[PDB]
Each structure stands twice: as C-alpha cells, then as structure tokens.
Amino acid sequence: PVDVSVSIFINKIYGVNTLEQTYKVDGYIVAQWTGKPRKTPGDKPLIVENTQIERWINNGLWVPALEFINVVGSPDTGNKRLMLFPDGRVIYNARFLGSFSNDMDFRLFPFDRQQFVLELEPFSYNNQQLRFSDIQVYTENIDNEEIDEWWIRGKASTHISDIRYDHLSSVQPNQNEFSRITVRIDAVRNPSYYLWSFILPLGLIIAASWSVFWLESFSERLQTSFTLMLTVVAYAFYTSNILPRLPYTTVIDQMIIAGYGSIFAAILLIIFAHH
Amino acid sequence: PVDVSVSIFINKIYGVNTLEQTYKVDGYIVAQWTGKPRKTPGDKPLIVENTQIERWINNGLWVPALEFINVVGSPDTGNKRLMLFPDGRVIYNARFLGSFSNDMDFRLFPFDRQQFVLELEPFSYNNQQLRFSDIQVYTENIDNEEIDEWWIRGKASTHISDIRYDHLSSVQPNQNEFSRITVRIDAVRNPSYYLWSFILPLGLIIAASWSVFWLESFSERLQTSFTLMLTVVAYAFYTSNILPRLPYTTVIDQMIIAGYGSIFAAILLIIFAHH
Amino acid sequence: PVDVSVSIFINKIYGVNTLEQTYKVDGYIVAQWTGKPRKTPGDKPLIVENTQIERWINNGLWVPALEFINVVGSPDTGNKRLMLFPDGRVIYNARFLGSFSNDMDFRLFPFDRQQFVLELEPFSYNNQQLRFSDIQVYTENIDNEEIDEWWIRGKASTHISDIRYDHLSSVQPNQNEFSRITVRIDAVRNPSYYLWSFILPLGLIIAASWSVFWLESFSERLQTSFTLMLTVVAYAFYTSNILPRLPYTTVIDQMIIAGYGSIFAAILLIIFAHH
Amino acid sequence: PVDVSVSIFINKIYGVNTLEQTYKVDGYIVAQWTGKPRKTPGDKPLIVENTQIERWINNGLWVPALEFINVVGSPDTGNKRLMLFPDGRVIYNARFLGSFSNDMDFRLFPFDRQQFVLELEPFSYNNQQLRFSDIQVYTENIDNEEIDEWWIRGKASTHISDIRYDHLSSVQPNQNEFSRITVRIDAVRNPSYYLWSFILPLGLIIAASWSVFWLESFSERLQTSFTLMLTVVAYAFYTSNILPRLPYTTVIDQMIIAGYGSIFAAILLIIFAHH
Amino acid sequence: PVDVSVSIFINKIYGVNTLEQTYKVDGYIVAQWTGKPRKTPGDKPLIVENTQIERWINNGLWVPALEFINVVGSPDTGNKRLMLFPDGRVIYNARFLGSFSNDMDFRLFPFDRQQFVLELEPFSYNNQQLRFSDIQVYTENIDNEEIDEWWIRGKASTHISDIRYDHLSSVQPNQNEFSRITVRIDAVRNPSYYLWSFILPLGLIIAASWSVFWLESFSERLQTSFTLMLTVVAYAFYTSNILPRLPYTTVIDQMIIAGYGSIFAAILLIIFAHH
C-alpha cells in the first residue's frame, strides 16, 4: 500500500447555518505521497496547474480523488496544482471549499459547544493500496481567533481510523476497508449576544407577569395578562429562525413556555378565585 | 438481456423541505453486471476514476446511465469509478446526490409517517437488453438513527417491477417496457417539537377564551376577545412556513380555526345576549 | 422541409411561484423525424447516451436544438438519448426541466384558473427546413391528479402555428418564419385553503366591527376600533407574500381595504356624532 | 476596423428587485458583421448550433465576445447559433439572459420612473478593430405592454458612443477606446397598488390621530395614542421590504415619520397642557 | 523571479450583506508581465479570447492563476483575454467577480466605517518565480461615487507584502514565501437612513415611557407600560435582520435594551411604591 502524508490548512470557518445543520469551511489540502521516479525537465520540480493535470491523468499518472464524507453538495475546488519531484514524491495541493455537516446537538443553546469535523476518505481505493500515514492540521490562521459567535479554542485534534464499509462487501469480498481521516475542531458558542438580547427581556416579561400578579383590578388584570400573551406571541418569531427544527427543548423555548405557563397560571388563579 | 445486480448505500438523509415537497438523500450506487471478458493489465483489477471513463465509453465500452425518476433537477454525481474485472464482471460505483420527491400526504401533521422512495430506472435501455436482477439496500448508516425530526424505523423495503411507458409506444412498437426499481424507506415524524412548542400554547389560548367566557364586563369582554383575535392572528405566521400549501386541513390549522370559531362564538354569544 | 413528429410527456408540475410569475414543469421530450438512411451496427437500433452524441454532431449528424420560449433561465436537461434507426427515422428523447412563464392574470385570486403553456420553437431553423408535423401530449401522469392547489382538469390542448419574427427580417429577407408549438394545460386554483383560512376570519373581523358599532362607550369605542386597526394591520403581512405585486385589486386585498373602510366609517361616524 | 450591425430583441422584462438594485431582461442578440468570404457546403447558408462553434473558433474563425457591462453575475446564454453566408456576412444570433443594474433613484417611490439600460461593449477588441455601426432595437414584444408594475411607454432609445477606459492605458498606450452601446427603455412604476393599499390606510391612521385629538379623557387619550404608536409600528415591516436600503427619504417613509410626528405632537401637547 | 505588473480596475461594489459577512466587488484584472519573445502573426499583437487560451496553455505557454484569498466560493470569471506582444510582454486581462470577506467590526453600527479588501496571491508559484512588482488601482469608476449606504471616500490604498505560509513548510523546506497583494478601499456607512427611520422613533418610545411616568392611574400605568413592552417587542424583528449575529452590543440594540430597562424601571418603581 502506498502511504499518503496528508496535511490540511484551514483558512476560514464561516456560515454555520444551524437551521438546516451545516457549516462551511474554507482552506487548502496537501497530499504528499511517494511514487515511481521520473525524468522531469531539468532539476527544477515540475508544476502543473488547474485544467492541465487531466492530460497527465490520461497519460497514465495516478492521483487519488480524496473526497469528503460529511460534505453536502459537491465541494467546489478552485485552483489545484500537482508537484512532480524527480526522485519520486508527488504533492497534490488543492483549494477545497464545501458545506460540511455534524450531528451537532443543541442541548444548551446559548451555552453551546460542538466539534467541527472534516471526515476525509479515499473514494476509489481501499486500505490495500492507499493508507493514510499521518496528518498534521496546520491551522494557524484560525487556531486562536474570534469568528462569528464561534470561538475556536484549542488545537484541532486528528484521528486516523480504518472504517469498514459493508455495502461493498457483496462486490468486494475481503478488500472493503478504508483508511478514514477525521479531524475535530473544538468550537464554542459565544453567549454574549443571546444573554444581552433575548434572555434578559424575557426576564423583564416575567417581571411584568409579577406586576400583573400585583395588579388590583380583576377585569384589568385579565386585559393586561392578555396583553402579556400578545407580548410572548411577539416572541418565537424572530427567535424561531435562530434555533433549528429540533425535537427536544432548548433553554430559550423553555423560557418561552415558562412565560406562557406563568401567564396561564396567573389567569387560572384569578379566574378560580373569582369563581 | 444483460442482468444488473444493483445495490444502493444510503449515507445521509437530510433537508426534508415539506414546503415545496422534496427531500435530499445522499449515498452510493453500485451496479454490478457481467459482460464480455477482456485482457486487463496484469491480474490486478483495473480502476478508472472520474473524467477518464469517457475515454473508455468512446473506445466502445458499454455502461448504463442509471437515472432516477422521482428526482428534481440533475442529480449531481461527485466522484465515480468503474471496475473492470478480467473474467467479465463490471462494477459501476458512483456517489449520487439529488433532491427526491414523494406524494407524501400530511393528513396528520405532527403524528406523521411517510415513505422515502428512490425510483430508479434505466434511461436508455428497455427490458429486452437490461433487466435488474436484484437489489439489496445496505443502509446500515441510517437504519436505526435519529435524523432531524424523521426517525428511520425498520429496514428499507425494495421492489423490482416492469413498468411500461406508453409515450415510447408510437416509436417503439413492442419493446417499450422498463425494469424499474423502487426502494421504500419508512420514516416517521418526531412529534415532540410540535407537541412541546405549538399545540399546548394553543390550548392555553383556548383556556384564555374560557377565561373571557368567565369575564364580568361586557365592553371589557369585547376588548379582551379582540385581543384574543390579535393572539390567534399572531399564529399561522411562523406556523404557515412549516406546513405546505395543502388543500385539505391538518390538525394544526384545524386548531387555529377552532380557536377562531370559539372566539367568534364567544363574541356572537355576548352580542346576542346584549341585544 | 424535414417534418418533425414531436410528443411531450409531462411528468410533474410543481412550484407555481405566483409571486414572481413562474412555474416549473418536469417531463420528457420526444422528437421523431426522418432523415438519410445509414448503416447501423447490426439490425438492432443504435443507442447513444448523454455526452456522446456530441461526437456524432461533430461527425456530421444533424439534430435540432428544440428550445423553449416561455422558459426563464437555461432549461437544465438531464440525461438525453438519440435513436438511430437504420431505415431513416431518428428519435431525440431528452428529459427537460425548466421554469416556465405565462401572463397568468389573478382577477379572482381564490376562484382562479389559468393555462400552463410550454411554447416550443426551433432555435436555429425556420419553416423552410424544419416544420413541426404534429404533436400529441401523452400527459397521462398528471391528466387527472390533485397537485398542490392546482387541479389539472381536462386534457392538454395543443397548437401548431407559424410565428413570424421581424428581428431576423433585416438579416434574412424572406425566410424568417418559424413553426411554433404551444401546448395549453388548463389549471384551476383549489380555493379550499383560502376559504378556510383567510376569508372567513376576515368576516369575523367585520363582525367585530359590527360589535364595536353596537358598543356603548364612546372613548372605549375608539379604543376598540383602534384595536381593530391593529387587527387588520396584522393582516396583509402573511397575506402579502401569497399574492404577487399586482397593479389592480384581487378580492383578498379588496376585503382588507373594505375592512379598513368599514373601520374608518365607524370612527368617522362616532366622531361626527360626538361633534 | 470591421463594422458590426447589432440588433437586440427584447423578449420579457421581469423581476425588478429594487431591494438590491437589479432587474432581469430576457431576449435575443443579433450581431451581423462582414468578413472574409468562404466556400460553404452548397449555396445554402451554413448553420452551426451550440457547443459546435467552438470547433470553428479553434479552426481559426473570428467571433466577438459581446459582453454586457451593467450585468451582475455571468449572463447565462442558452442556445446560440452562428450563420456563415458564402459571400462574407456572419450573423451571431444568441439568447442572452442576465440580471442588469441601473443607478435607479427612488425620489418619488409610487410616482416613479426610470430607464432600463443594457450597456453593451466588446470585451476583447477596441475601436481600432471592432466599431459598432448601428443598432435597431426591435422590441415589439414589450413595446406597449403591461408588465408587473412597470408600464413600458415609448420606444427603446439607443446610443452609440466611444468610451475610453484608462485602466488599459498603462498596457495599451494609444489604443484603449471602446465602441460602447447603451440602450434605454423608459419604464414607469404603476402607482395603483401603493395608492390602493399603503397610502390611504395611513391617511386613516392620521384621521384616527385626529380622533384622539378629539378625545375627552386624558389618561384614555394617552392609552389610545400609545395604541396609535402600536399601529404605526405595525407599519414599516411589510413596508420595509418593498423600498430599498436608501439614504434619503421617499414619500412612504415620510408619511410614516409624519404619522409618528403627529402622534408625538399630540402626546407632547396633552402632557404640556396637563402640566 | 519573473516580475508581474498588476493593475486592478474596480467597476462596481454592491451587495454588502453584513448579516453573513460578505461583499461583492465587480471589475477587471490586468496582469502585465514579461516573458520569452515569440513570433506572432504579423506585427499586430495576437489576441486570444475565452475558451481558446487553454490550447496555448497545453501548447506550453505559462500563465499564472492569480487567485483571491478573501473570496468565498469560486470567483466566476466571465470573458478573459491574453495579449501576446512579439517582443516579450504578456497581458492577462480578465473580468473577475466574487464575494469577498473582511473582519469588518460593527462597534458603531450607523456611524460605521470599514475597509474593503481584495487580498490577491499567486496560487501555484512562490516568491522565487513570481514576485509582484507594483500595483496601481485605477478605480476611477467608484473613486468618488454614492453607492448604496457605502460612500467611497479617498483613493484605494495598496500594499505589497511577502506572506509566509507554514503549511507548505513540511513539503517545501525553504521556498514557501508568497508575494501577496492587499488593496484597501475605505468605505463609510451613510447613517441617514438609520437616523431617519430607526433611532428617532425609539426616542419617541422613550418619550412615551416618560409619559407613562407622568401617568396618574396605577393599574392604567401598568396597562400602558405593558403596551410599551409590546411596542419594544415590535422592534428587534425588522431590526434584527439588518445587524449581524454579533457577540458584543451595537448602539441600536443598546437603545432597545435601554428602552427595556427604562420600562422595567418604571414598573418596578410603581410596584415598589404601591407595596
């Protein structure tokens, strides 16, 4: 098996659209791996640019199509280049960009932390021909930076594993195991925006519910508490477009339903006392 | 007729946009089928990658264009590879991705269950040359997993049928029958989010309608009930973007119109009692 | 002139986005037309798939580029195939998909009916070389089906006309007439959703205006009628995104402005009676 | 310099999205220009379709890439054809479609009129080789028609000018002048929709402000005027998505701020009279 | 190293979508650089258009792929041309368009000023072969113009720096330094729209809070102040879609939370005085 020494450069991480569960990562991929030595023009290494390596592939050169697994859509590769050292090593430097997906739970919506993953796997070849030797993620551009609401703390952890696919077992009997790469970028939500803008005014609405508890006119209590329902109905509209369609409850919608429950408790209390 | 032994690997199912009736499925397609034996380089099987099989097709090799029927748009195939075993078998492994469509009724919107289908059919050849032998959907990645609000329960059922198209009958008199593949993935809506977030506060609004029934000031009853109309008007706005444009009624809009009817019943009752 | 016997298969009609005046139609196009006989391999007809007919076109084969006229954007053709019968007939079966546009008036918005048209025309050739012989729209998939709010009643009517373009008259003196195809699919809005969800609650708001006519406290009448303005302002917001930017009035915005006029009539009446 | 006799056919004008300053125009471009005579097959003119003229370009044929200047994005050309008359003239008929941009002021938002421009310019060649002879816009399809809210009155005016670019002066010393085409389609907003739907209910809100001026209970005056603020806050939400992000004021937001000023004048008057 | 004399023409700057941190810039790129002299047809310079320079690249011609760094997505190049002067100079004129990204803080949201940057860098070659000699941004089209809310004041500043990438150090030991270009266009938000439309009505709401401070009925004070909460809840909905998801506070959301704090101060004051 021909070992590949991959190394991923992360340039920017942006557009974490949690509504439909994706995030875009932009950067560079480097795939150094050894091969048969050849005679290049001069002692200088040979550089072949985009839309010219296809001639080399048709001429008989091998280059692996390192696809991504957790990507949605086609990863739109920009410029891509292919080193050809005379003594044997080949470097496949390409600029990758795609929308990547994680499971990415939201148990605590403002106090939130997940992992950004780039699950890389050879599409065509299995562990018998291509096995990934090592990976070093040189992510010095975003290693300690403040991007969007996602603070990237710590270095990017890496994994090299042998993942066996069973859907190729019917067509490949014993050679269907793949050398998979999984990097993990630890990212934490910055909760300053939500704490400043969404949570405290909900506390003010709950304080207004305490005020209508303190109110001293029963029909006017009912009128004010219906205005409270109008106030909480004013929520979860510019709020529903920031949390995803999610089966369990966050703390934000828990605060919304707690305000609804307190308001309804106030009205059921005053009606049951009136009757 | 040359038999094809297809096998579909389902990787991820995501983005079930019920508003305009689509869902995206991502995965791998494997099409094993026998052919004329050839002399490959060495005893090793021959691997041809993306944008290189076109040379083989121009050289005279046959490969079927297995299209999808329930797909909208072009299915953006990523990397695709073509085995060439020396003794005759050919494997066409490709990574497919497209937006697929089902009829997908919504008679019970939160308590909802449908089938995700991938209706596969040979585009160019009929039952006389290409007949699908068998399919085994090795969907072990999503067989029992919790994705979005869609819990995938049970294994993926399969069907092989002979579907006759009549629009080719005028140009092909007796040979216009197609061997069609229909897989069925049983999927159920998780109703936890809607039960927690939409249905119970509507019950609180109906309880507030009971409270304004209990109210003891006629002009103030009218004022509060108009605030109730404002409250129900606050619904079906962040709610109308989660159910599709659909001719009959769900239970959610049935609850909305029941709240409207109860509110109007309260007002017509108090006005008819006043007169 | 070489006659072409076209026949369009309609698969699905979806996504009638009336806001910016488009609708998507998906289906198959068949273009049977006779030509010079050739020697095909064997007595079997020759099948050439996608991205292989270009070699035949470069080799000297003629195939017409049947474009659409009422399409917006490029119609994204998927797989496309080209029969070659030995005795002379050629069949050009392709899968077309595009967003199509009609004038599509909305004089009665819920009680609405229009025609879906697919205006087909040869792009390159005029009536002297290519004249469309006949069309039979075999639309059995959507002939009597319930899609979205659009019930497709009746069969699809067809037209063959000779449309003369004047912009080619300066460059082609006497040969600038085109054999145009216009099919017409009669489609009717299903008014159940609007009658159930939008029109009747507006009647309830008008009944509340009758109630504030019945009210017996002048300052409280003014307060309630301003709450009525708040109620009608709550409309035409989730309503304005369902009707297009349209110069005249529908019946929905007529109901909105009638509610506004009744509310303002109530307030001007009570103010003029107060003064 | 080789003269080009261009003539643009306008098919449809649609999608004038004033929010981010664009409009789409669809139609046909015809570029007749003389060249070296050649021997075509027979006396019949030669027709070459899409994705086949590239062979002629590689064979040595000249064809200008007539780009657009005020276009945003790439103009997605559909089918395109190239005449080859034997005696010398060449006609380049193509179907262009793109999103075009004008400065397009909005000083009077409902009583609005602008010019739709299609600024055409040769990308590669300057005035020394390619000079546009004349243009006649045969826009008979939209010359007098009612599209969206834009009534197209009058014929489309044309301009031929020599525009000098200075960014090519450092690399081309004396030959950097371009023969530019600017057509102008005079378009006027139809103000019926805004006059019927937005302006008159604002007058009703101002009349309600007159009514709260007429009101006879000071605390109830304050309550009603705060409901007036709620009413005007209900505006500029479904209104802010119809006018662009624009530095000066239209008449619509002038009416909004005039309502705000009248409401605040009423409250400051009653508070200053109370004190 | 072969020096390159680049010069960027800026045509339009539009679509500064601050919500997800991007801005589009449209214009022309000119890359003049010397090379080996060749025999061109005649003394006239040779012009090669789009989709024809690939033949020259395959024939052995060198042309650099000048990529952008701060671009998101692929920059969709339109028409592109390549001069070939006989004595040696080569000019690579291309029309670039892409969405570019800056850090772009928003510490003062209406009183806002940032820099638009176009960070240009050779993708394939390092400082040993390609070093950028000089840049002159001939931006006379937008140098002093009023675009959107962004007034472009001053000329576009330029920078030429040697930026060393460390992710290529493992594969290139001593030759991994890149000659990077960074232009800076100084742009200032026009604050007229926000001052006219958002800030002053917030001052009117604060004045209404002063009015409810002046109010003389405690239950009616509570009712009015809850209507004030409804008024401020009416904000930050058509306001939240104009400022990005941002961790710290602007002055607009500071005004929103100051209104919330003043309203809650009023209610806590009247409740504590009542108790």
Numbering used by the authors:
A (entry chain C), B (entry chain D), C (entry chain E), D (entry chain A), E (entry chain B): 11 to 285
What does the primary publication say about this deposited structure?
To test this possibility, we reconstituted WT ELIC in spNW25, a circularized nanodisc with an average diameter of 25 nm, for single particle cryo-EM analysis, and determined a structure of ELIC in the presence of agonist (propylamine). spNW25 nanodiscs are significantly larger than the 11 nm (spMSP1D1) and 15 nm (spNW15) nanodiscs previously used for agonist-bound WT ELIC structures. Initial inspection of the micrographs showed multiple ELIC particles in most nanodiscs and localization of the particles to the rim of the nanodisc. Consistent with this observation, side views of the 2D class averages and the resulting 3D reconstruction using C1 symmetry showed significant MSP density on one side of the TMD. A C5 reconstruction of agonist-bound WT ELIC in spNW25 also did not show densities for M4. Unexpectedly, the structure in the largest nanodisc, spNW25, deviates most from the liposome structure. In the spNW25 structure, there is a shortening of M1 and M2 and tilting of M3 toward the membrane that decreases the height of these transmembrane helices along the pore axis by ~1–1.5 Å compared to the liposome and spMSP1D1 structures. Along with this, M2 is tilted toward the pore axis, narrowing the pore even further at L240 (9’) and Q233 (2’). Contrary to what was previously suggested, the agonist-bound WT ELIC structure in a large nanodisc (spNW25) deviates most from the structure in liposomes, indicating that such large nanodiscs do not recapitulate the membrane environment of a liposome. Strikingly, ELIC localizes only to the rim of this large nanodisc.
Here, we report cryo-EM structures of ELIC in liposomes where the ion channel is confirmed to be in resting, activated, and desensitized states. The structures of ELIC in liposomes have the same overall architecture as structures of ELIC or other pLGICs in nanodiscs, consisting of a homopentameric assembly around a central ion conduction pore. Each subunit consists of an ECD and TMD. Proteoliposomes were formed using a 2:1:1 molar ratio of POPC (1-palmitoyl-2-oleoyl-phosphatidylcholine):POPE (1-palmitoyl-2-oleoyl-phosphatidylethanolamine):POPG (1-palmitoyl-2-oleoyl-phosphatidylglycerol); these lipids are known to support ELIC activity, and phosphatidylethanolamine and phosphatidylglycerol are the two principal phospholipids found in gram-negative bacteria in which ELIC is expressed.
